[PDB]
Amino acid sequence: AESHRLYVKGKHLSYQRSKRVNNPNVSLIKIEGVATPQDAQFYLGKRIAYVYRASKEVRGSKIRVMWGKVTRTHGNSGVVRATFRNNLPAKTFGASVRIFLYPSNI
Amino acid sequence: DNTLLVTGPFKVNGVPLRRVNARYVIATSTKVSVEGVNVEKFNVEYFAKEKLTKKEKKEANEIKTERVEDQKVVDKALLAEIKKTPLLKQYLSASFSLKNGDKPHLLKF
Amino acid sequence: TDSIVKASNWRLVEVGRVVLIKKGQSAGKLAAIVEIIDQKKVLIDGPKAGVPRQAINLGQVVLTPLTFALPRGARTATVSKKWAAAAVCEKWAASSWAKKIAQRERRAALTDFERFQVMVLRKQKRYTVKKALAKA
Amino acid sequence: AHFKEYQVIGRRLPTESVPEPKLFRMRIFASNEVIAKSRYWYFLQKLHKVKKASGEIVSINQINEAHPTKVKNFGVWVRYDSRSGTHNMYKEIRDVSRVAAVETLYQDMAARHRARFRSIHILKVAEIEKTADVKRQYVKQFLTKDLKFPLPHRVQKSTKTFSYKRPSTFY
Amino acid sequence: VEPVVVIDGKGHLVGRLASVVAKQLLNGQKIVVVRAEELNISGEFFRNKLKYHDFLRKATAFNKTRGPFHFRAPSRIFYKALRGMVSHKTARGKAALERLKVFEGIPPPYDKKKRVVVPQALRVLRLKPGRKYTTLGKLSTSVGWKYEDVVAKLEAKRKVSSAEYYAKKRAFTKKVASANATAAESDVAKQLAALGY
RNA sequence: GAACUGGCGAUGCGGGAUGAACCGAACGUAGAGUUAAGGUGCCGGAAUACACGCUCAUCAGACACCACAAAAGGUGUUAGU
RNA sequence: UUUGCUCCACACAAUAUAGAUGGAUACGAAUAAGGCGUCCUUGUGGCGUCGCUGAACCAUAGCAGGCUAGCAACGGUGCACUUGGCGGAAAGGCCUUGGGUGCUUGCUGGCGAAUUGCAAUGUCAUUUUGCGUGGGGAUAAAUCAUUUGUAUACGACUUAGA
């Protein structure tokens, strides 16, 4: 067809933070479509990929991926907490990111 | 090894006899009967990769005949069950993709 | 000539007014207003749909265009009897509001094979409608 | 909180000079048993020469509403402490049960006189059994024959941050 | 959900719209706000004129050129109210603010596009009926904006052209609705009705 | 200038924008969970939550320490005797 | 100034991305009112219907979407042209005429796909520049130095000089 998307779009909002101290080890993700923790409970444990590009070709590609997963819900509005192998570079606040449907329970 | 044996059928969408992981599929509610297929031939030793040595490096750049007539035996038994209810051949030939406005936590498969 | 005003009527709250519970434990059923507590809340009862007789804030219900006869303060046996006599459940079901609700829940209850089927049928219907869009 | 009504019956501790004290009983609106017994001992220390160390509580029982689906008019007599003095007030509330009536009473006093729970004393609450004994216009307004009124200016709260048409406030 | 969101600023409250839009930019949504002369501020016109005069008094004493700049256009007033809610002195704030452009009227890039509203910042949904409000164009031309009438003339011309568009669109959609109704009650129509479409 | 206690001095951490003393809590290096005091329009992590009222200020008001306001008045408005 | 400059087509390199992954899908006004349809005496008109959110509408099947056969219609859509308009607020876009060409999943068939081995973004976008081709297009000024004095601390300014 014309669409081939097998993931859900999301936005990298910020780190986990207090009013004046942030914590880069936990990122905050807005998954689009979900507006409550009860709907966000479907997406727990799903893999997340941040997909970006670079000028230098490394192993056949100019596209590099950072992997992570959803761990828990955050707040009352469907924001989730996500942890990555290496933390997200904080210039990606507001950048798009992919939530895959695996590991599936359905 | 906790894997699922699946087939396309190969005549429909070109997916051969294969094994997949159960955590990487979505079980839809659409059900066909697979009684009449003799799948006890296949096992974990049926799929062997014949592991490659470290010396054989592919600088620049086939199929088992046993595998291809096994596929031809099973898929002709599946498609007879496919022909009963309408539009299943078209459904299995078409691909799945998420459109704009599809919420997977609300979708039923 | 004659004097003309724009009337601008809307959906008075009184006894016998049929309401739809918007949010809460019922959340989508019908009830009948039995009495009016004050400006902001009323005593309702929904005995056919299984809504218990209760006082409720008016922000948690939506008033429907349906009305039937009740005396004020009627108990639930009389409420159910007059509800069945006026037969307002299928009068609600005949409305396009309830048809919209039923369409929404049907589209929610569709599966992937049914979504494929409606895509094929919509392509066929679009073919015949765009064929009709060439003669006028 | 969301109030409940309890009867609390207590007495003095029995002595040899006087066994069987007189078993005083009071009706308390409170959130739970602990607050109910505390308010019971507060009002008995205001009334008689007794305190909690010198007395005991023989019974506490929740009194729920006899007809929780009848719409009543209640007259409530209240003491409250203002910033300069102590005043008596009589307010009447049209509502379906006694605990909800005193909940709206506490909200009404806190809203209109800035009186707190520690300042309000509930003298009594009683159902007005007959109309035309209702003396306040704001509740006598709702007792008229064939009462009906519209609700102008409906505002529907949205779930999306963007709406694709200009909304209507018809009801 | 959208590449660019075009917001019709008419009938909106300035602070509530700015707090919606600033969060949208910080989340990464591109926003363009049109018709900035029709924003509303709650309160009397005289109160908001006094507020702007209190703001207009404030300037650097030894050199007025480096002081706070008092911008007079309605779009720049909205930009001031929004820059107050974005942390504009950082690179993230600058990258957010470059996703925004605010206009008086609807310019020709956006007159053929779709305009949306924000229902939690609309005046008719937020204010009690009876409270007084202002129009940002009237306040701005009271405090020194020079282009209130040319925007009105351009908006009149644009509305004439848009009504000419809408008449043709309405005629076409009535033809399409007529054909859909006549091509309904066939077998595919009843199957789609059973399946929910 | 004294009395009892707790502190700062000798002490970082979360909150009070900011601050020696206030509130919370005292500190090896890390991970996960839960909270205190304080907050949840945006800056800013978190409900433009729910519920009942009150107030429209041609100097509104917005939180302890704390960064001020009184006597006297007002058919402004609300509730009472 | 030893063949330089610009534009057009693709050919290869480099360069990055504040962050495509079906579609930014166009009345205006009011909100104690409207929208749409229809009728008439065309109005601040009569009658009917709708809202109660976009949970919509359009699009959406095919090797990341192939190679072929037929049926039914004379539709739908893409590409390069082509005729006629309209658009100056930041127009740089919108509509339309005609023919060509490709596809059509509206309907019914035939062949292909495996081995990426049980997942690894599994690579499909647009931004700038350079260097090659081969096809057009055009053949300047400014500054220093000299001079002026309507100018001037010096710069700067205003003049003149084939």
Tab-separated table of N, CA, C and O in Angstrom, chain E residues 1-62:
chain	number	residue	atom	x	y	z
E	1	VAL	N	0.321	15.142	15.378
E	1	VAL	CA	-0.672	14.567	14.481
E	1	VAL	C	-0.643	15.317	13.145
E	1	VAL	O	-0.908	14.739	12.088
E	2	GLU	N	-0.261	16.592	13.187
E	2	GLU	CA	-0.247	17.431	12.006
E	2	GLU	C	1.148	17.989	11.770
E	2	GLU	O	1.921	18.147	12.720
E	3	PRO	N	1.508	18.274	10.522
E	3	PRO	CA	2.759	18.998	10.270
E	3	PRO	C	2.716	20.420	10.801
E	3	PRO	O	3.542	20.803	11.631
E	4	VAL	N	1.755	21.213	10.326
E	4	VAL	CA	1.546	22.582	10.782
E	4	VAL	C	0.096	22.710	11.217
E	4	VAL	O	-0.806	22.240	10.516
E	5	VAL	N	-0.133	23.341	12.363
E	5	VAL	CA	-1.477	23.602	12.860
E	5	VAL	C	-1.743	25.093	12.753
E	5	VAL	O	-0.985	25.906	13.297
E	6	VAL	N	-2.818	25.451	12.061
E	6	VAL	CA	-3.176	26.840	11.811
E	6	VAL	C	-4.320	27.171	12.758
E	6	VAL	O	-5.409	26.605	12.637
E	7	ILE	N	-4.100	28.096	13.684
E	7	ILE	CA	-5.090	28.446	14.698
E	7	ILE	C	-5.695	29.799	14.361
E	7	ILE	O	-4.979	30.798	14.236
E	8	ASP	N	-7.016	29.831	14.243
E	8	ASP	CA	-7.756	31.079	14.088
E	8	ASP	C	-7.852	31.722	15.463
E	8	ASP	O	-8.484	31.181	16.369
E	9	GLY	N	-7.243	32.889	15.622
E	9	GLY	CA	-7.147	33.506	16.930
E	9	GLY	C	-8.381	34.250	17.394
E	9	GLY	O	-8.374	34.835	18.478
E	10	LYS	N	-9.443	34.237	16.593
E	10	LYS	CA	-10.637	35.011	16.905
E	10	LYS	C	-11.402	34.405	18.074
E	10	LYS	O	-11.694	33.208	18.087
E	11	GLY	N	-11.737	35.243	19.051
E	11	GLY	CA	-12.523	34.817	20.188
E	11	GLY	C	-11.766	34.059	21.245
E	11	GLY	O	-12.390	33.485	22.139
E	12	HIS	N	-10.444	34.033	21.182
E	12	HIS	CA	-9.644	33.296	22.142
E	12	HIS	C	-9.130	34.220	23.234
E	12	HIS	O	-8.996	35.430	23.050
E	13	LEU	N	-8.834	33.628	24.380
E	13	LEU	CA	-8.216	34.347	25.479
E	13	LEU	C	-6.707	34.260	25.357
E	13	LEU	O	-6.162	33.194	25.052
E	14	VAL	N	-6.042	35.389	25.621
E	14	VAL	CA	-4.634	35.546	25.273
E	14	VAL	C	-3.760	34.622	26.112
E	14	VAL	O	-2.948	33.863	25.573
E	15	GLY	N	-3.950	34.632	27.432
E	15	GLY	CA	-3.102	33.831	28.297
E	15	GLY	C	-3.333	32.340	28.165
E	15	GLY	O	-2.381	31.557	28.157
E	16	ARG	N	-4.596	31.930	28.051
E	16	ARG	CA	-4.897	30.508	27.947
E	16	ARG	C	-4.457	29.952	26.602
E	16	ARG	O	-3.907	28.843	26.531
E	17	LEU	N	-4.637	30.733	25.533
E	17	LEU	CA	-4.118	30.331	24.235
E	17	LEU	C	-2.599	30.271	24.240
E	17	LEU	O	-2.016	29.340	23.683
E	18	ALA	N	-1.939	31.232	24.895
E	18	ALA	CA	-0.482	31.238	24.927
E	18	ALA	C	0.069	30.063	25.723
E	18	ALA	O	1.077	29.470	25.334
E	19	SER	N	-0.594	29.690	26.816
E	19	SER	CA	-0.148	28.532	27.579
E	19	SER	C	-0.431	27.216	26.867
E	19	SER	O	0.275	26.237	27.113
E	20	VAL	N	-1.449	27.158	26.007
E	20	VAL	CA	-1.612	25.974	25.164
E	20	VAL	C	-0.512	25.911	24.111
E	20	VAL	O	0.160	24.883	23.937
E	21	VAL	N	-0.298	27.029	23.421
E	21	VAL	CA	0.591	27.071	22.269
E	21	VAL	C	2.047	26.889	22.681
E	21	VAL	O	2.795	26.188	21.996
E	22	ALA	N	2.460	27.449	23.823
E	22	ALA	CA	3.837	27.307	24.285
E	22	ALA	C	4.178	25.856	24.602
E	22	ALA	O	5.268	25.377	24.272
E	23	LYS	N	3.241	25.134	25.218
E	23	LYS	CA	3.444	23.709	25.459
E	23	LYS	C	3.464	22.917	24.160
E	23	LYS	O	4.208	21.938	24.045
E	24	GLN	N	2.667	23.332	23.168
E	24	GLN	CA	2.709	22.664	21.864
E	24	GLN	C	4.062	22.827	21.172
E	24	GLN	O	4.624	21.852	20.655
E	25	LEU	N	4.597	24.051	21.151
E	25	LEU	CA	5.948	24.289	20.633
E	25	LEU	C	7.031	23.562	21.409
E	25	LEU	O	7.993	23.078	20.806
E	26	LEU	N	6.928	23.505	22.734
E	26	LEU	CA	7.960	22.799	23.481
E	26	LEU	C	7.869	21.295	23.269
E	26	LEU	O	8.885	20.600	23.350
E	27	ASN	N	6.675	20.778	22.985
E	27	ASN	CA	6.552	19.382	22.599
E	27	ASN	C	6.965	19.136	21.158
E	27	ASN	O	7.205	17.985	20.786
E	28	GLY	N	7.043	20.174	20.337
E	28	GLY	CA	7.546	20.032	18.990
E	28	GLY	C	6.528	20.168	17.882
E	28	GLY	O	6.820	19.776	16.750
E	29	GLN	N	5.347	20.698	18.164
E	29	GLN	CA	4.330	20.907	17.147
E	29	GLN	C	4.506	22.286	16.528
E	29	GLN	O	4.687	23.272	17.244
E	30	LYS	N	4.467	22.352	15.199
E	30	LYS	CA	4.560	23.632	14.509
E	30	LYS	C	3.204	24.322	14.502
E	30	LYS	O	2.203	23.740	14.075
E	31	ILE	N	3.182	25.572	14.948
E	31	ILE	CA	1.955	26.334	15.136
E	31	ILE	C	2.086	27.634	14.360
E	31	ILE	O	3.112	28.313	14.456
E	32	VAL	N	1.062	27.979	13.586
E	32	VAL	CA	0.914	29.325	13.049
E	32	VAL	C	-0.441	29.878	13.482
E	32	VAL	O	-1.463	29.196	13.375
E	33	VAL	N	-0.431	31.085	14.040
E	33	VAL	CA	-1.620	31.727	14.585
E	33	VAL	C	-2.001	32.867	13.657
E	33	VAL	O	-1.197	33.778	13.424
E	34	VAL	N	-3.218	32.825	13.130
E	34	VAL	CA	-3.713	33.863	12.244
E	34	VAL	C	-4.810	34.640	12.963
E	34	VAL	O	-5.337	34.206	13.987
E	35	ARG	N	-5.133	35.819	12.412
E	35	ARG	CA	-6.156	36.741	12.927
E	35	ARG	C	-5.877	37.155	14.370
E	35	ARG	O	-6.731	37.035	15.248
E	36	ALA	N	-4.661	37.645	14.611
E	36	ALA	CA	-4.262	38.018	15.963
E	36	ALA	C	-4.947	39.279	16.464
E	36	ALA	O	-4.918	39.537	17.670
E	37	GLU	N	-5.567	40.059	15.584
E	37	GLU	CA	-6.264	41.269	15.991
E	37	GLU	C	-7.598	40.989	16.668
E	37	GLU	O	-8.198	41.918	17.217
E	38	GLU	N	-8.075	39.748	16.644
E	38	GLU	CA	-9.355	39.388	17.235
E	38	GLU	C	-9.213	38.567	18.511
E	38	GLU	O	-10.173	37.905	18.911
E	39	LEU	N	-8.045	38.574	19.147
E	39	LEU	CA	-7.926	37.990	20.475
E	39	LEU	C	-8.690	38.799	21.509
E	39	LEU	O	-8.976	39.984	21.335
E	40	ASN	N	-9.014	38.126	22.603
E	40	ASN	CA	-9.768	38.710	23.694
E	40	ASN	C	-8.972	38.615	24.982
E	40	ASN	O	-8.268	37.636	25.226
E	41	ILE	N	-9.075	39.657	25.793
E	41	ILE	CA	-8.527	39.675	27.140
E	41	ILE	C	-9.691	39.948	28.073
E	41	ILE	O	-10.497	40.844	27.809
E	42	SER	N	-9.804	39.158	29.131
E	42	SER	CA	-10.868	39.379	30.096
E	42	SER	C	-10.625	40.669	30.868
E	42	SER	O	-9.489	41.031	31.175
E	43	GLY	N	-11.703	41.364	31.169
E	43	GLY	CA	-11.571	42.615	31.877
E	43	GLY	C	-12.002	43.793	31.026
E	43	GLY	O	-12.216	43.681	29.816
E	44	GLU	N	-12.141	44.940	31.674
E	44	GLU	CA	-12.536	46.173	31.016
E	44	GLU	C	-11.421	46.679	30.098
E	44	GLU	O	-10.224	46.455	30.339
E	45	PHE	N	-11.840	47.357	29.020
E	45	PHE	CA	-10.898	47.992	28.104
E	45	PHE	C	-10.057	49.031	28.825
E	45	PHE	O	-8.863	49.171	28.546
E	46	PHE	N	-10.659	49.745	29.774
E	46	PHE	CA	-9.911	50.739	30.526
E	46	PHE	C	-8.901	50.091	31.463
E	46	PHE	O	-7.798	50.625	31.632
E	47	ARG	N	-9.245	48.943	32.060
E	47	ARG	CA	-8.285	48.204	32.880
E	47	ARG	C	-7.095	47.745	32.061
E	47	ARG	O	-5.945	47.866	32.494
E	48	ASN	N	-7.348	47.207	30.871
E	48	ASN	CA	-6.225	46.709	30.087
E	48	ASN	C	-5.419	47.840	29.456
E	48	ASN	O	-4.207	47.696	29.260
E	49	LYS	N	-6.050	48.983	29.184
E	49	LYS	CA	-5.293	50.153	28.754
E	49	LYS	C	-4.415	50.685	29.877
E	49	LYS	O	-3.272	51.092	29.638
E	50	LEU	N	-4.924	50.671	31.112
E	50	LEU	CA	-4.115	51.068	32.258
E	50	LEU	C	-2.968	50.095	32.492
E	50	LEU	O	-1.866	50.507	32.870
E	51	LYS	N	-3.214	48.801	32.270
E	51	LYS	CA	-2.165	47.793	32.386
E	51	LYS	C	-1.067	48.021	31.358
E	51	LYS	O	0.128	47.943	31.676
E	52	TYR	N	-1.456	48.328	30.119
E	52	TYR	CA	-0.456	48.598	29.096
E	52	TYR	C	0.286	49.899	29.360
E	52	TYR	O	1.465	50.000	29.030
E	53	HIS	N	-0.365	50.893	29.962
E	53	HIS	CA	0.351	52.119	30.299
E	53	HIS	C	1.337	51.897	31.440
E	53	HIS	O	2.433	52.476	31.443
E	54	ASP	N	0.975	51.044	32.402
E	54	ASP	CA	1.914	50.656	33.451
E	54	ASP	C	3.104	49.897	32.886
E	54	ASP	O	4.230	50.066	33.365
E	55	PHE	N	2.873	49.052	31.884
E	55	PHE	CA	3.979	48.388	31.200
E	55	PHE	C	4.795	49.379	30.378
E	55	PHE	O	6.019	49.249	30.269
E	56	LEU	N	4.135	50.384	29.815
E	56	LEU	CA	4.788	51.324	28.917
E	56	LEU	C	5.666	52.304	29.678
E	56	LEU	O	6.595	52.875	29.102
E	57	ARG	N	5.379	52.516	30.962
E	57	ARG	CA	6.245	53.347	31.790
E	57	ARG	C	7.639	52.768	31.974
E	57	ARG	O	8.593	53.530	32.153
E	58	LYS	N	7.782	51.453	31.921
E	58	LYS	CA	9.012	50.799	32.330
E	58	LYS	C	10.038	50.869	31.211
E	58	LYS	O	9.824	50.322	30.128
E	59	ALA	N	11.160	51.530	31.478
E	59	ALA	CA	12.235	51.636	30.505
E	59	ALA	C	13.534	51.886	31.246
E	59	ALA	O	13.525	52.359	32.380
E	60	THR	N	14.647	51.575	30.590
E	60	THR	CA	15.958	51.791	31.187
E	60	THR	C	16.265	53.283	31.253
E	60	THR	O	16.130	54.000	30.258
E	61	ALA	N	16.676	53.745	32.437
E	61	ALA	CA	16.759	55.176	32.707
E	61	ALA	C	17.906	55.834	31.954
E	61	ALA	O	17.736	56.915	31.380
E	62	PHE	N	19.085	55.216	31.951
E	62	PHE	CA	20.233	55.891	31.363
E	62	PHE	C	20.257	55.800	29.845
E	62	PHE	O	20.958	56.589	29.206
